[PDB]
Amino acid sequence: MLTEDQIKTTFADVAGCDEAKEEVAELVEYLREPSRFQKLGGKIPKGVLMVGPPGTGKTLLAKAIAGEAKVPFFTISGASRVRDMFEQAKKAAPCIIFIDQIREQTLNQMLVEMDGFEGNEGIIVIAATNRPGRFDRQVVVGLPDVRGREQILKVHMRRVPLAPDIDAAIIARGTPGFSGADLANLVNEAALFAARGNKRVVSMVEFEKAKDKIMMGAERRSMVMTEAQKESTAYHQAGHAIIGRLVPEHDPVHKVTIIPRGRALGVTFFLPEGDAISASRQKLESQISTLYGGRLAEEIIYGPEHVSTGASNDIKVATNLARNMVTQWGFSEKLGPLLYAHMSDETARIIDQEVKALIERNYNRARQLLTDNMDILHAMKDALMKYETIDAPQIDDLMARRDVRPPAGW
Amino acid sequence: MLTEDQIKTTFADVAGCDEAKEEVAELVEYLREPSRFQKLGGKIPKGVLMVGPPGTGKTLLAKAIAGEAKVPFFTISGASRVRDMFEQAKKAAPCIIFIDQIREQTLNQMLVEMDGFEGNEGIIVIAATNRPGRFDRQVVVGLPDVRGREQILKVHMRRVPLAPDIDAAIIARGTPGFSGADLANLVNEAALFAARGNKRVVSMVEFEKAKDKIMMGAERRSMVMTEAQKESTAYHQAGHAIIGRLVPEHDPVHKVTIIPRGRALGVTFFLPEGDAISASRQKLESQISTLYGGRLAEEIIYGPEHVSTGASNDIKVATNLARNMVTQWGFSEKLGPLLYAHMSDETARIIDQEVKALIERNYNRARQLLTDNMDILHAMKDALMKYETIDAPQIDDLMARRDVRPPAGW
Amino acid sequence: MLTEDQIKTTFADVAGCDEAKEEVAELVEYLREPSRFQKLGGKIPKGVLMVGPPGTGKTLLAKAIAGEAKVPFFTISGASRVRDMFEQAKKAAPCIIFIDQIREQTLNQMLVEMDGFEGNEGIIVIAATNRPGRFDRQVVVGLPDVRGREQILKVHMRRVPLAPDIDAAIIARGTPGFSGADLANLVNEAALFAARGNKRVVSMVEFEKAKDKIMMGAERRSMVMTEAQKESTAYHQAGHAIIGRLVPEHDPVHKVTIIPRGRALGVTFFLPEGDAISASRQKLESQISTLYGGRLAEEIIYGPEHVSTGASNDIKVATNLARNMVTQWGFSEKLGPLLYAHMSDETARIIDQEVKALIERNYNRARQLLTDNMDILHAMKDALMKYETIDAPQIDDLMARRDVRPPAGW
Amino acid sequence: MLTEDQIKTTFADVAGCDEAKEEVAELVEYLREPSRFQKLGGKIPKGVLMVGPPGTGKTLLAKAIAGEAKVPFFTISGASRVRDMFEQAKKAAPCIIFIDQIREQTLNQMLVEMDGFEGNEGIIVIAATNRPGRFDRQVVVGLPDVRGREQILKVHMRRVPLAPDIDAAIIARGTPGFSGADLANLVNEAALFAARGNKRVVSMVEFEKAKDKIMMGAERRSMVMTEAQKESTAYHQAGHAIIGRLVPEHDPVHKVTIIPRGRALGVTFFLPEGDAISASRQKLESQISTLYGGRLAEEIIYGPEHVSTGASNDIKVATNLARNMVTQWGFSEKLGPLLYAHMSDETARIIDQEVKALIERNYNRARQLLTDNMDILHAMKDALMKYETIDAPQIDDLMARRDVRPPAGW
Ligand SMILES: Nc1ncnc2c1ncn2[C@@H]1O[C@H](COP(=O)(O)OP(=O)(O)NP(=O)(O)O)[C@@H](O)[C@H]1O
Ligand SMILES: Nc1ncnc2c1ncn2[C@@H]1O[C@H](COP(=O)(O)OP(=O)(O)NP(=O)(O)O)[C@@H](O)[C@H]1O
Ligand SMILES: Nc1ncnc2c1ncn2[C@@H]1O[C@H](COP(=O)(O)OP(=O)(O)NP(=O)(O)O)[C@@H](O)[C@H]1O
Ligand SMILES: Nc1ncnc2c1ncn2[C@@H]1O[C@H](COP(=O)(O)OP(=O)(O)NP(=O)(O)O)[C@@H](O)[C@H]1O
Ligand SMILES: [Mg+2]
Ligand SMILES: [Mg+2]
Ligand SMILES: [Mg+2]
Ligand SMILES: [Mg+2]
Ligand SMILES: [Zn+2]
Ligand SMILES: [Zn+2]
Ligand SMILES: [Zn+2]
Ligand SMILES: [Zn+2]
């Protein structure tokens, strides 16, 4: 299943993954001109394995390779019968074979062909899926860094007009772990979204709209909630916010919103402001106090008899983070640095008492902060209603004990 | 499988799911008039996934809109032999392909040739079942909300006479989670049920009968219960009704019955009365209290050793609900807000003492309530025995301590 | 299925495996001059199984021996239709058959009848895969030793020039457990690496580069990390280092790195310095202290709060190693020499107490070293950030408290 | 399936297995001369399956069956076509059948029909595998007892020459459970082994070599071990030998060696000195003691912190042997004669106390024995280093505190 082509994918079109690009260009240089290797180039690399995560160009270096070198054929893909592949891939074979449908005589057969019946054409296997000599060099095609996000976003950005306010880095930042595909969609749906309202110029506003519709369910506004339900979910979806600021070393607050998306009643967003190299104990502790903040915000205002089963998911991740700290990253003085993840019955008790002590300490801190800053909570409950959504400039105005400015737009 | 029809029924047929309706009418307008590539990147959306629960219009929309643009095709289907037949879709298309026979390279493997041979029709592989680029848009098709229940009900309600007193919403609330087929054939069975007695005009009187039949089971009077057995159930199903009222923040009572249907001697119905997102501590404690109404009625009236295995299913639900509160949804002072749903034996016993304390507190509140209002219980036993069924207005008469009007009908 | 030929390459090819070499020259001698066995040995050695580890010369021996005795065909290999094929290979044959596609008791009476038909051919089923009379004689093909590693390295190093300063043995001990194949690769990639920069011929300077590239990841340099971040990961690696030279009986240090090579920001290499024959109590405890020494550097420099979660994989290695001592090899005075690998709940508590005592003693000792040698840590932190890599000679310079000389090259 | 030979191998080569051989010779005589039915033996055994362990002649009594009676037929060895079989078996062919090829009453049905329809051939199905009428008999083909080892050895020992001082029984005891194939090729490899050095006649000196190459890996002298490593093993293998003698009722020591063979640096051999019928408490305690000889030799000689993980495999067998005695075989005063191999936690504690006490008592005895005889340990350390191997006479020389003579040979 191989086809002769004239125009196909090159290398300069792909972005990011510079190391993978480097190994690709080495293979491309090699594919012809073997005489350059007077140092015994020595069995042109046989077998290339990409163990990268699925979805980020795991097979785009294959397309790039097939187009590259002016070798006019592609992957050979697109049981037993491989030997017919060995037979056909001897004459006029455009320098590779790529085999992704995910019994290893391929090594002996390929060696025999490349030694006897192949005039240094260097047809070798390169494969992608998710011992030395059969898979010698394995090249990782990984998820882009934020720098890479900027590049790819600019690359697909060619096709449209731009309104002045576009800042590619922020849009890149908000997509942690989005592949090339996900960015491609972000742009595409920006275009579609702008068309829906028939807007000539496309700016960052609909851009954020598209990002949101991607990660979370698209806005589902037709649902009705009573007057009081709108009010309660406004406190709980604040409180998350007023704590995100006062606790130390946290990702800053980007958005606080109230209209339901998918299965969620309200959302508070965060922006990593970098890539996750590692975490401090301090910031890990701060996360907990931000998480439970909503339930406390709901209890102080309403009474402990009316606190609702809305904090279920907020509770779960909190308890999951808590026990990881004690169990498998050190972080507890009594037990000491060890890995407890068959133990005794006494040990199973000390682990629990430590977990409870941690959550209790931060829960008290979270309770203390809200009581002192009561004016903000009422001030922020109000604006959350008058306008349905709050951006970053507005939140800072609240947190400074000042007047709220109207949101961007409206 | 291609089926050629010129014209079909309009888009008034689908009701509810307005968000899905929107995210689909964009596709509908796109299918033709692709000249709107003035955003200059508007490449066709992708295979669209409808990932709702089975049973709620997952495929209904097809006929409403496939009439639009007069596409002479349908769902294409209605172990990879397709590929060629997949590439068949280049002439007289519906501007889609639909596949609900529900490995992963199939989409992008053929999409290039698709759009290359697609006449700007916006062909996609929209699919329904229970990495962007192979599937991008996942559109929820959810169960009709209590507002949407009215819309669907009035849609299928164009085919009959109507009695003056019919109210749609009351039937709406009675069917929580009923999908479209449920409502449609509820109307259908209303029609049939009226016809069986040869009553001229349908009405709510049998409408509720149809609901009750489908939801629970046909009422079986062919059973014989002795005289002394009709009396015992009469108390149990009261007591449920007496305590459902005096306890705080409960769904209100609709009707109370004695005729045996399915496997249960008596049923007490509650009306959710306005869909609620989530519940609160007070409501859950009210439910735990009300569930134990019957056993206490039996125990006081008949003695501590004539109680029976009738509260078997009432017990299980109660102890399940009480177990969820302390383990998952916070709601206990001693243990704290944490997910307990492994652990030490000391912790294992605290949870048991906690659930026991909870059940006991509400059980005693239940007994103290029923003891004081002794007369109501007897007064209500008499009515259930005279007329085998009591409606909502009658209960107000009993609870006010005045005489009972005869039921509507009779 | 067998391949006709005339001659093959000599016996200088296979290196090491001298015991296997002998127990193969037996078959080589036997296949010819069978009458030499006047001591009635001429009961042909039946199926010979090579039961070595995979990837280390399991099937390498083909060329030398198939050439010797001038046997002209290879293995036959290259659900039992075979038996006729077993009949087929009895005249003018490879002199034996080899079959690596790995009910089975079928071998004996079949090839016995054949050898009765064989004109003293002595054909056997010599088999490879990862009772007497069918698999009586098996010849192991083990992982190469250091004195063997060096020789294989010299053999494949017949095909290029070398720069004067190459010591084979250092590269030999650098590759523990890797086969002939991995050494083949090391040389091949050395050639390529030299070619890439257009260097005339290669010393060991890039030889180590090839080792690092294969055993670890390639130098993923393209990443950026802030200045304040490198300083965090450069106080850590120095701290596996200075604590690995003040403890007794440890493997010496070779390199320390700051440039990320995969999943790790830093690497500290140790040179095994001899093949592993088992171990000693002192050496195991010293390893335990070396591992935990990294995170103590962070704790002293930045304080107990800002101690990151990068010390994770260090914790696991230590807790398994410390657990294995008191559960499998004796090494605990309280419990005694025994194998605890059910068991009571009292016995489990003692085990955790012993594991914790071990790790506590070594943790405290690894702390007592850095506090006294604070001046080394700062100095080694500077160099690691000045030049990204430190060679062995400078580490000695630092550890002696004198001025640092620049690296080889630069 | 079909093969006729007028004359084949007899049964006098069956040496061994006298008892089953008799039950077979009964049948052999009966196959013809049925006229001895004057007690109605009219009932040839319908089916007897040799239920012995695989590997010991389970197919050699069938071959004897075909040979005997001068009856011209080979047995059928060599999903139901069996009806073919009981069809064909009527051509004046008596009792010449075997089935080890690979719907349940089939054997009895066809057998009855044919033997009723056959001319008194007395046909029976005999099978080999690992209610009378389908399998009436079961005959055991067991492993050769120490008497029978002599018979098989003398049978195969005709071919070679004999050296003067070869003793069969000593080789016999050396192979505790080798089935006839193992003895046969032990002789074979004796012949081969002599041939390599090309000696005139084969003494037992090489016979020990053949046994050692079979039982454990062949000598691997190619390994190089440092000087200080040869001294370490030299002590551990002694110590095993010193405590083996001074402790009561043990299998005596045969040979003690240092050159590595397999995965073990040293091996100490014992001779069972008779068949292992059943063992007693004194003997089992002797074993538990002797095993821990090596670790104590290391600990006294070098120090309490230069011990190693070499006693890893000595520990395990010890804790198994000690665990069986308390749990399965009585042999403990406190718990009593019961099978403990579920149960309360208190009981789990008692068993560990007991196992620990047992190991402790014998360990202390082992220490006290060795310290008193310190000179023997040194004197025996020297001999192992000088000559790599010590035989039986030398151990007596050491233990009497005299001068050592050199081994046979050298
Ligand atoms: N560096 C990149 N620049 C631009 N687009 C990219 C890049 N990497 C991946 N893509 C996208 O990937 C698509 C095709 O690559 P693809 O076959 O998906 O490999 P992949 O993305 O890793 N899929 P998968 O097999 O799950 O890993 C293109 O159409 C792009 O949208
Ligand atoms: N929103 C709706 N409005 C009107 N009728 C509906 C609606 N949803 C479902 N129906 C009825 O349900 C049927 C449509 O069948 P179908 O498309 O299978 O729904 P579905 O049950 O969600 N699909 P599935 O879950 O796989 O069985 C028709 O009889 C419709 O009258
Ligand atoms: N002793 C050796 N000397 C030289 N090259 C060797 C040696 N052992 C292995 N090789 C190389 O390794 C390959 C030998 O064939 P191969 O079938 O891989 O044995 P193997 O590596 O053990 N394979 P396997 O063990 O079945 O996984 C060839 O590429 C040889 O060049
Ligand atoms: N009593 C005996 N005297 C001599 N040789 C014997 C004797 N018993 C078995 N053998 C040898 O055993 C071999 C045949 O063994 P075999 O028929 O397989 O028994 P078996 O090994 O149990 N069959 P199986 O276990 O199913 O593989 C021949 O080489 C015989 O020489
Ligand atoms: Mg891909
Ligand atoms: Mg469906
Ligand atoms: Mg192999
Ligand atoms: Mg056999
Ligand atoms: Zn929340
Ligand atoms: Zn009830
Ligand atoms: Zn570390
Ligand atoms: Zn030992």
Coordinates of N, CA and C and ligand atoms in Angstrom, one line a residue, chain C residues 236-237 240 266 290-295 298 310-315, ligand 11:
Chain C
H236 N 21.2 20.0 44.8 CA 20.7 18.6 45.0 C 21.7 17.6 44.5
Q237 N 22.2 17.7 43.2 CA 23.1 16.7 42.7 C 24.4 16.7 43.4
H240 N 24.2 14.4 46.5 CA 24.5 13.0 46.3 C 26.0 12.8 46.2
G266 N 18.7 16.3 36.8 CA 20.1 16.1 37.1 C 20.5 14.6 37.2
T290 N 23.7 7.6 51.0 CA 24.0 8.4 49.8 C 22.7 8.9 49.2
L291 N 21.7 8.0 49.1 CA 20.5 8.4 48.4 C 19.8 9.6 49.1
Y292 N 19.6 9.5 50.4 CA 18.9 10.5 51.2 C 19.7 11.8 51.3
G293 N 20.9 11.8 50.9 CA 21.7 12.9 51.1 C 21.4 14.1 50.2
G294 N 20.6 13.8 49.1 CA 20.3 14.9 48.2 C 19.3 15.8 48.8
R295 N 18.2 15.3 49.4 CA 17.2 16.2 49.9 C 17.6 17.0 51.1
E298 N 18.8 20.4 50.1 CA 17.7 21.4 50.0 C 17.2 21.8 51.3
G310 N 10.8 16.6 44.4 CA 11.7 16.0 43.4 C 12.5 14.9 44.0
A311 N 12.5 14.7 45.3 CA 13.2 13.7 46.0 C 12.4 12.4 46.1
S312 N 11.6 12.1 45.1 CA 10.6 11.0 45.2 C 11.2 9.7 44.9
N313 N 11.7 9.5 43.7 CA 12.3 8.3 43.3 C 13.5 7.9 44.2
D314 N 14.1 8.8 44.8 CA 15.1 8.5 45.8 C 14.5 7.8 47.0
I315 N 13.3 8.2 47.4 CA 12.7 7.6 48.6 C 12.4 6.2 48.3
Ligands
ZN11 ZN 18.0 12.8 44.3

